């Protein structure tokens, strides 16, 4: 037991994985509805150029 | 091979919940006992001094 309350590194690490996990999940629920796996250039820039040309 | 390397990408990098959670609970219980054991040791010096005013 290590007593400490001014900081909680366990919560901070858990939050860091929390943010990353459902950031990608937030990228979901939109590909499903739109039916496209490419919606923004930030996802696949090379894919956007060729897809628009096609 | 993609399926096989993903299968190998588990128990190597991916964690399991069966054996690791009982280790988490064992560690948490151990921390509970470790925090409680000093609660029964802080008064020991006080009781030792109590023989004389």
């Amino acid at each position: 037991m290590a007593v400490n309350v001014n900081t909680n590194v366990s919560a901070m690490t858990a939050q860091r994985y929390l943010t990353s996990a459902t950031n990608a999940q937030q990228s979901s629920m939109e590909r499903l509805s739109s039916g496209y796996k490419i919606n923004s250039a930030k996802d696949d820039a090379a894919g956007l150029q060729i897809s628009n040309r096609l | 091979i993609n399926e096989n390397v993903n299968a190998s990408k588990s128990r190597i990098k991916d964690t399991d919940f069966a054996k690791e959670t009982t280790a988490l609970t064992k560690a948490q219980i151990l921390s509970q006992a470790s925090s409680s054991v000093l609660a029964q040791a802080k008064q020991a010096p006080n009781s030792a001094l109590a023989l004389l005013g």
Side-chain angles (χ1 to χ4, degrees):
Chain A
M1 188 35 207
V3 303
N4 184 300
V5 70
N6 270 305
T7 37
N8 208 341
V9 82
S10 185
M12 147 164 168
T13 316
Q15 273 135 7
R16 200 144 218 190
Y17 294 138
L18 178 293
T19 54
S20 53
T22 165
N23 271 329
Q25 184 255 14
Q26 188 43 54
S27 210
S28 200
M29 272 154 315
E30 147 182 34
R31 27 196 64 240
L32 282 298
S33 33
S34 71
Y36 288 154
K37 56 161 288 201
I38 282 315
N39 325 65
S40 155
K42 269 250 176 261
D43 230 329
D44 197 0
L48 192 48
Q49 261 49 56
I50 178 82
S51 87
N52 291 321
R53 289 208 267 94
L54 262 296
Chain B
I1 320 88
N2 177 42
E3 285 221 271
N4 271 8
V5 302
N6 290 148
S8 75
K9 200 211 163 86
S10 80
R11 105 185 70 81
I12 280 306
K13 158 130 94 151
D14 194 338
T15 188
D16 85 22
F17 286 50
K19 67 163 306 315
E20 163 291 346
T21 298
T22 166
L24 171 134
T25 310
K26 159 194 211 329
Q28 182 274 329
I29 291 304
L30 254 175
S31 91
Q32 178 46 52
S34 76
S35 71
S36 79
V37 77
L38 51 83
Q40 336 297 332
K42 273 269 183 123
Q43 57 268 22
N46 314 139
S47 72
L49 170 65
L51 88 168
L52 198 34

